[PDB]
Amino acid sequence: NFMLTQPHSVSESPGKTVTISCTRSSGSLANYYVQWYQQRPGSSPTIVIFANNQRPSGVPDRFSGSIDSSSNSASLTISGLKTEDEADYYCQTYDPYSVVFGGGTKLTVLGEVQLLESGGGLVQPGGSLRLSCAASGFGFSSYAMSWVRQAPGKGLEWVSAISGSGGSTYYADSVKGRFTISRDNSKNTLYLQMNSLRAEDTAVYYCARDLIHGVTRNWGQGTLVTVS
Amino acid sequence: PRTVMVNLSSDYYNRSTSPWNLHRNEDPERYPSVIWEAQCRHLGCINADGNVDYHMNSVPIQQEILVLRREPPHSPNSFRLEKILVSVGCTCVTPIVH
């Protein structure tokens, strides 16, 4: 597919203005929406910017997104830094087949929709396990869903996605062939079947609600899966 | 469980920004036996330039319709009222509302 290259980390003083870049390796960046997410230590990833520059309600106007087609990259600009902004910042865009997150940029400051995951735990290498996602607060059948993982010591990694009706399924290369995504619109529950798990599959798996394919808007608490 | 008695061309699939094709669901033990369901052609919608634009999505509009199923199985003049879900057409959805 493609890669999203971000700076590894950025460090600035409070009150300054910072810019985080996000370069797409293949395909025109202007053909697919770009989203920005903030993840604090031990916290669930929250959305800061979606649809290139659209800012949700609850995010101060000092956050802003922009796109540069000539460099095929997107930028999140945080004006007037403060201690609260200190977190990891991931960019995310998509292609007609997959969804990709960036490596993540660690920003250091110099000193209603509801998703519930379940089913995670300990399992042996080669065993099976299934997660569930209890959705509430919205028309579940009208929204595409997706699974996003975060391995310990790594960044956010997209796992799989499913359309609202359940007719279209997408998987990441590292997972495709072993996992199976499905959903039950009658019970507002989204499932992820996992078979033939490997040690690399140890991660926190988040439930994600997407306005359209590849534009995530809400995140769950995440469930911990360990294989040893 | 109450049994009573009861007296017994469009081309938007080709002209829509979110086109679709018709599938022929057939069930001889059902009335109507032939129902045309919609499956969208593309993931995205057709923009003004005529390309598949992926800032938007084609999604099926699904409704619940009443159908009659022969109960007992293979028995005429005897039906059980059923409620199935069918796709009537595809629409184009954007992530931004203004």
Short mmCIF file of C-alpha atoms in Angstrom, two decimals:
data_model
loop_
_atom_site.label_atom_id
_atom_site.label_comp_id
_atom_site.label_asym_id
_atom_site.label_seq_id
_atom_site.Cartn_x
_atom_site.Cartn_y
_atom_site.Cartn_z
CA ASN A 1 0.00 0.00 0.00
CA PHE A 2 1.77 3.11 1.29
CA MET A 3 3.59 4.55 4.29
CA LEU A 4 3.09 7.73 6.32
CA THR A 5 6.37 9.26 7.48
CA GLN A 6 6.27 11.54 10.52
CA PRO A 7 9.11 13.05 12.56
CA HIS A 8 9.98 10.76 15.44
CA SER A 9 9.65 13.44 18.14
CA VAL A 10 9.33 17.20 18.56
CA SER A 11 10.27 19.30 21.60
CA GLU A 12 9.35 22.96 22.06
CA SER A 13 8.63 25.40 24.87
CA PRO A 14 5.10 26.34 25.99
CA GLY A 15 3.56 29.19 24.02
CA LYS A 16 5.43 28.53 20.77
CA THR A 17 3.96 27.18 17.53
CA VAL A 18 4.81 23.68 16.30
CA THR A 19 4.20 21.89 13.00
CA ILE A 20 4.14 18.11 12.51
CA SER A 21 4.53 16.72 9.00
CA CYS A 22 3.07 13.52 7.54
CA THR A 23 4.36 12.44 4.12
CA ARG A 24 2.51 9.87 2.01
CA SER A 25 4.74 7.45 0.11
CA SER A 26 2.40 6.53 -2.76
CA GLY A 27 -0.78 7.98 -4.19
CA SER A 28 -1.94 11.58 -4.24
CA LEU A 29 -2.53 12.82 -0.69
CA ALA A 30 -5.19 15.21 -1.99
CA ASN A 31 -7.32 12.23 -3.10
CA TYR A 32 -7.92 10.91 0.44
CA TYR A 33 -8.85 12.64 3.68
CA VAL A 34 -6.22 13.02 6.40
CA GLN A 35 -7.01 12.71 10.10
CA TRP A 36 -4.98 13.65 13.18
CA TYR A 37 -5.22 11.90 16.54
CA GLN A 38 -3.80 12.62 19.99
CA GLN A 39 -2.76 9.83 22.37
CA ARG A 40 -1.66 10.63 25.91
CA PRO A 41 0.30 8.25 28.18
CA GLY A 42 -2.01 5.36 29.02
CA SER A 43 -5.01 7.07 27.41
CA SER A 44 -7.21 6.18 24.48
CA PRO A 45 -6.43 7.97 21.19
CA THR A 46 -8.69 10.97 20.63
CA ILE A 47 -9.35 12.87 17.41
CA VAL A 48 -7.92 16.36 16.93
CA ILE A 49 -8.34 16.97 13.18
CA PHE A 50 -10.37 15.09 10.57
CA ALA A 51 -11.09 15.67 6.88
CA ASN A 52 -7.80 17.54 6.32
CA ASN A 53 -8.74 20.62 8.35
CA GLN A 54 -12.11 20.04 10.06
CA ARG A 55 -11.85 20.55 13.82
CA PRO A 56 -14.39 18.78 16.05
CA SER A 57 -16.28 20.36 18.92
CA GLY A 58 -14.13 20.41 22.05
CA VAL A 59 -10.77 20.99 20.33
CA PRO A 60 -9.47 24.57 20.73
CA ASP A 61 -8.94 26.61 17.58
CA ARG A 62 -5.16 26.63 18.18
CA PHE A 63 -5.09 23.14 16.64
CA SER A 64 -5.29 23.21 12.85
CA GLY A 65 -4.54 20.94 9.91
CA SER A 66 -3.29 21.65 6.40
CA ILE A 67 -2.23 19.74 3.29
CA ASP A 68 0.63 20.34 0.84
CA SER A 69 0.01 18.57 -2.47
CA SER A 70 3.41 19.55 -3.91
CA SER A 71 5.24 17.69 -1.12
CA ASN A 72 2.44 15.06 -0.85
CA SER A 73 2.28 15.62 2.91
CA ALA A 74 -0.09 16.85 5.60
CA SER A 75 0.67 19.11 8.55
CA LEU A 76 -0.85 19.59 12.00
CA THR A 77 0.00 23.00 13.48
CA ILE A 78 -0.31 23.51 17.24
CA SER A 79 -0.08 27.23 18.02
CA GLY A 80 0.52 28.34 21.59
CA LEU A 81 1.80 25.12 23.13
CA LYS A 82 0.92 24.11 26.67
CA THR A 83 1.61 21.21 29.01
CA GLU A 84 -1.67 19.45 28.13
CA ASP A 85 -0.65 19.14 24.46
CA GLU A 86 2.29 16.89 25.44
CA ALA A 87 1.26 13.58 23.85
CA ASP A 88 1.76 11.37 20.81
CA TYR A 89 0.29 12.63 17.53
CA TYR A 90 -0.57 10.21 14.73
CA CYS A 91 -1.74 11.02 11.23
CA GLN A 92 -4.01 8.68 9.31
CA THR A 93 -5.26 8.45 5.74
CA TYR A 94 -6.45 5.66 3.47
CA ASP A 95 -6.58 4.12 0.02
CA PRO A 96 -9.50 2.20 -1.58
CA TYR A 97 -8.27 -1.00 0.10
CA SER A 98 -6.50 -0.25 3.39
CA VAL A 99 -6.10 2.31 6.17
CA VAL A 100 -2.66 3.46 7.30
CA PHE A 101 -1.48 5.27 10.42
CA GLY A 102 1.81 7.11 10.65
CA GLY A 103 4.72 6.16 12.85
CA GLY A 104 3.68 8.81 15.36
CA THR A 105 5.31 12.04 16.54
CA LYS A 106 6.14 12.46 20.23
CA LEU A 107 5.47 16.08 21.19
CA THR A 108 7.27 17.10 24.40
CA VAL A 109 6.54 20.40 26.14
CA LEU A 110 9.71 21.62 27.84
CA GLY A 111 9.05 21.82 31.58
CA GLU A 112 -23.03 10.23 22.73
CA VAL A 113 -20.97 7.56 20.98
CA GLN A 114 -19.73 4.80 23.29
CA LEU A 115 -17.53 1.83 22.35
CA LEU A 116 -16.67 -1.04 24.71
CA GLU A 117 -14.18 -3.79 23.90
CA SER A 118 -14.01 -7.23 25.50
CA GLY A 119 -12.57 -10.69 24.96
CA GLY A 120 -8.87 -9.97 25.38
CA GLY A 121 -6.55 -11.92 27.63
CA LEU A 122 -3.79 -14.51 27.61
CA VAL A 123 -3.52 -17.20 24.93
CA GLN A 124 -0.96 -19.69 23.64
CA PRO A 125 0.95 -19.22 20.36
CA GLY A 126 -1.37 -20.68 17.74
CA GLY A 127 -4.56 -20.41 19.78
CA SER A 128 -7.71 -18.53 18.85
CA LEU A 129 -9.57 -15.59 20.39
CA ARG A 130 -12.46 -13.30 19.49
CA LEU A 131 -13.07 -9.70 20.55
CA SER A 132 -16.43 -7.97 20.79
CA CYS A 133 -17.30 -4.28 20.54
CA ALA A 134 -20.50 -3.08 22.22
CA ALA A 135 -21.71 -0.03 20.30
CA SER A 136 -24.26 2.42 21.67
CA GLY A 137 -25.32 6.01 21.09
CA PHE A 138 -25.59 5.96 17.29
CA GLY A 139 -27.05 4.12 14.32
CA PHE A 140 -24.59 1.24 14.32
CA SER A 141 -25.66 -0.13 10.93
CA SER A 142 -24.92 3.23 9.24
CA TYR A 143 -21.22 3.40 10.17
CA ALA A 144 -18.18 1.51 8.96
CA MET A 145 -16.11 0.08 11.80
CA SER A 146 -12.45 -0.86 12.10
CA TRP A 147 -9.91 -2.41 14.45
CA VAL A 148 -6.68 -0.58 15.31
CA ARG A 149 -3.91 -2.16 17.39
CA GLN A 150 -0.94 -0.76 19.30
CA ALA A 151 1.86 -3.18 20.10
CA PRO A 152 3.86 -2.51 23.28
CA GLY A 153 6.67 -0.14 22.36
CA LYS A 154 5.19 0.55 18.91
CA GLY A 155 2.73 2.97 17.34
CA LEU A 156 -0.85 2.63 16.16
CA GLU A 157 -1.39 -0.06 13.53
CA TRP A 158 -4.58 -0.55 11.53
CA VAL A 159 -5.82 -4.14 11.63
CA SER A 160 -9.10 -4.47 9.74
CA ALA A 161 -12.24 -2.62 8.71
CA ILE A 162 -15.82 -3.42 7.71
CA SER A 163 -18.54 -1.45 5.94
CA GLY A 164 -21.78 -0.51 7.65
CA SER A 165 -23.87 -3.22 5.99
CA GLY A 166 -21.11 -5.81 6.42
CA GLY A 167 -20.58 -6.54 2.72
CA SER A 168 -17.06 -5.10 2.38
CA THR A 169 -14.10 -6.28 4.45
CA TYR A 170 -10.52 -4.98 4.60
CA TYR A 171 -7.44 -6.33 6.35
CA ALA A 172 -3.82 -5.36 6.87
CA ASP A 173 -1.17 -7.50 5.19
CA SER A 174 0.36 -8.60 8.51
CA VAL A 175 -3.08 -9.80 9.63
CA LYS A 176 -4.98 -10.79 6.46
CA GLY A 177 -5.62 -14.51 6.12
CA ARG A 178 -5.63 -15.11 9.89
CA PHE A 179 -8.24 -12.65 11.21
CA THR A 180 -11.92 -12.36 10.28
CA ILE A 181 -13.99 -9.23 10.91
CA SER A 182 -17.78 -9.37 11.15
CA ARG A 183 -20.64 -7.38 12.65
CA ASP A 184 -24.19 -7.84 13.93
CA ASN A 185 -26.27 -4.74 13.22
CA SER A 186 -29.28 -6.18 15.05
CA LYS A 187 -27.30 -6.27 18.31
CA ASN A 188 -24.97 -3.29 17.63
CA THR A 189 -21.90 -5.48 18.22
CA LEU A 190 -18.74 -5.60 16.11
CA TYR A 191 -16.53 -8.71 16.21
CA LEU A 192 -12.95 -9.62 15.29
CA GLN A 193 -12.12 -13.32 14.94
CA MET A 194 -8.41 -14.06 15.48
CA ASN A 195 -6.85 -17.36 14.40
CA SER A 196 -3.24 -18.57 14.41
CA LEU A 197 -1.96 -15.72 16.58
CA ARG A 198 1.76 -14.97 16.81
CA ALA A 199 3.90 -13.19 19.38
CA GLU A 200 3.74 -10.06 17.20
CA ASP A 201 -0.04 -9.93 17.75
CA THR A 202 0.42 -8.86 21.39
CA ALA A 203 -1.21 -5.42 21.40
CA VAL A 204 -4.08 -3.33 22.72
CA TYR A 205 -6.96 -3.58 20.24
CA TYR A 206 -9.21 -0.53 19.92
CA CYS A 207 -12.71 -0.36 18.47
CA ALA A 208 -13.15 2.45 15.97
CA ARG A 209 -16.17 4.15 14.39
CA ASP A 210 -15.58 5.64 10.94
CA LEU A 211 -17.69 8.34 9.29
CA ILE A 212 -16.46 6.99 5.95
CA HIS A 213 -13.94 4.30 5.03
CA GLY A 214 -10.64 5.41 6.56
CA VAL A 215 -11.84 8.45 8.55
CA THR A 216 -12.00 7.38 12.20
CA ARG A 217 -14.06 9.59 14.52
CA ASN A 218 -14.45 7.68 17.81
CA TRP A 219 -12.29 5.21 19.73
CA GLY A 220 -13.00 2.63 22.40
CA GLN A 221 -11.16 1.82 25.60
CA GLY A 222 -9.14 -1.00 24.05
CA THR A 223 -8.65 -4.61 25.14
CA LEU A 224 -5.30 -6.17 26.03
CA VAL A 225 -4.24 -9.34 24.20
CA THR A 226 -1.10 -11.22 25.24
CA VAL A 227 0.18 -14.40 23.57
CA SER A 228 2.91 -16.46 25.24
CA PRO B 1 -49.07 -17.29 16.38
CA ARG B 2 -52.50 -15.96 15.36
CA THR B 3 -53.52 -17.08 11.86
CA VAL B 4 -56.22 -15.04 10.11
CA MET B 5 -57.51 -14.65 6.54
CA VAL B 6 -56.48 -11.94 4.09
CA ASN B 7 -57.73 -11.08 0.61
CA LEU B 8 -55.03 -11.36 -2.05
CA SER B 9 -37.73 0.25 -15.49
CA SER B 10 -36.02 2.75 -13.20
CA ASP B 11 -32.43 3.59 -14.14
CA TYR B 12 -31.19 5.53 -11.10
CA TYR B 13 -28.73 2.65 -10.61
CA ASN B 14 -26.96 3.98 -13.72
CA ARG B 15 -27.42 7.76 -13.35
CA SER B 16 -26.59 8.20 -9.65
CA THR B 17 -23.41 9.65 -8.19
CA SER B 18 -23.42 6.41 -6.15
CA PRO B 19 -24.42 3.83 -8.77
CA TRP B 20 -25.34 0.23 -8.04
CA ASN B 21 -26.37 -3.04 -9.65
CA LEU B 22 -29.48 -5.14 -9.08
CA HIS B 23 -29.24 -8.63 -7.58
CA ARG B 24 -32.12 -11.07 -8.11
CA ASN B 25 -33.07 -12.63 -4.78
CA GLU B 26 -35.42 -15.52 -5.58
CA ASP B 27 -37.36 -17.67 -3.11
CA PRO B 28 -40.21 -19.87 -4.40
CA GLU B 29 -41.53 -20.21 -0.82
CA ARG B 30 -41.96 -16.43 -0.55
CA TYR B 31 -44.23 -13.68 -1.85
CA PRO B 32 -42.94 -11.79 -3.68
CA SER B 33 -40.64 -14.55 -4.93
CA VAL B 34 -38.43 -12.13 -6.91
CA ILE B 35 -36.93 -9.13 -5.10
CA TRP B 36 -34.35 -6.84 -6.71
CA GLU B 37 -31.64 -5.86 -4.23
CA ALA B 38 -29.05 -3.11 -4.67
CA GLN B 39 -25.27 -3.48 -4.37
CA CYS B 40 -23.15 -0.39 -4.95
CA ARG B 41 -20.64 -0.51 -7.79
CA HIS B 42 -17.84 1.47 -6.13
CA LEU B 43 -16.62 2.33 -2.66
CA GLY B 44 -16.58 6.05 -3.45
CA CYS B 45 -18.91 8.28 -5.43
CA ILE B 46 -18.63 9.78 -8.91
CA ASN B 47 -17.53 13.42 -8.73
CA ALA B 48 -18.02 16.14 -11.36
CA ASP B 49 -14.88 15.05 -13.23
CA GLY B 50 -16.36 11.57 -13.62
CA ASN B 51 -13.84 9.77 -11.41
CA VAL B 52 -14.32 7.64 -8.31
CA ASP B 53 -13.90 10.17 -5.50
CA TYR B 54 -12.95 8.59 -2.17
CA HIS B 55 -13.72 11.58 0.04
CA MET B 56 -17.27 10.20 -0.13
CA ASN B 57 -18.74 6.70 0.07
CA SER B 58 -21.45 4.71 -1.68
CA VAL B 59 -23.61 2.97 0.94
CA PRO B 60 -26.82 0.93 0.45
CA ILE B 61 -30.11 2.28 1.75
CA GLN B 62 -31.75 -0.68 3.48
CA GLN B 63 -35.42 -1.02 4.44
CA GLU B 64 -37.49 -3.66 6.21
CA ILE B 65 -40.36 -4.97 4.09
CA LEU B 66 -43.21 -7.35 4.85
CA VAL B 67 -43.12 -10.65 2.95
CA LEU B 68 -45.27 -13.78 3.02
CA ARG B 69 -43.54 -17.13 3.54
CA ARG B 70 -45.39 -20.40 2.89
CA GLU B 71 -46.09 -21.96 6.30
CA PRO B 72 -46.18 -24.94 6.50
CA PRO B 73 -43.32 -25.37 4.00
CA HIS B 74 -44.56 -26.18 0.49
CA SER B 75 -48.20 -25.37 1.24
CA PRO B 76 -50.27 -22.86 -0.78
CA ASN B 77 -53.06 -20.62 0.57
CA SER B 78 -51.17 -20.64 3.89
CA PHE B 79 -48.46 -18.12 4.77
CA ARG B 80 -46.57 -16.75 7.76
CA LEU B 81 -46.00 -13.00 7.80
CA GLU B 82 -42.26 -12.28 7.81
CA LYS B 83 -40.05 -9.19 8.03
CA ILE B 84 -36.85 -9.19 5.96
CA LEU B 85 -34.18 -6.57 5.21
CA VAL B 86 -33.45 -5.59 1.61
CA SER B 87 -31.25 -3.01 -0.12
CA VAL B 88 -33.37 -0.68 -2.24
CA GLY B 89 -30.61 1.62 -3.52
CA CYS B 90 -27.23 3.19 -2.84
CA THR B 91 -26.66 6.77 -1.71
CA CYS B 92 -23.54 8.92 -1.36
CA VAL B 93 -22.44 9.87 2.17
CA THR B 94 -19.89 12.55 3.14
CA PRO B 95 -18.08 12.78 6.51
CA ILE B 96 -18.69 16.56 6.80
CA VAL B 97 -22.14 17.96 7.59
CA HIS B 98 -22.73 21.69 7.11
#
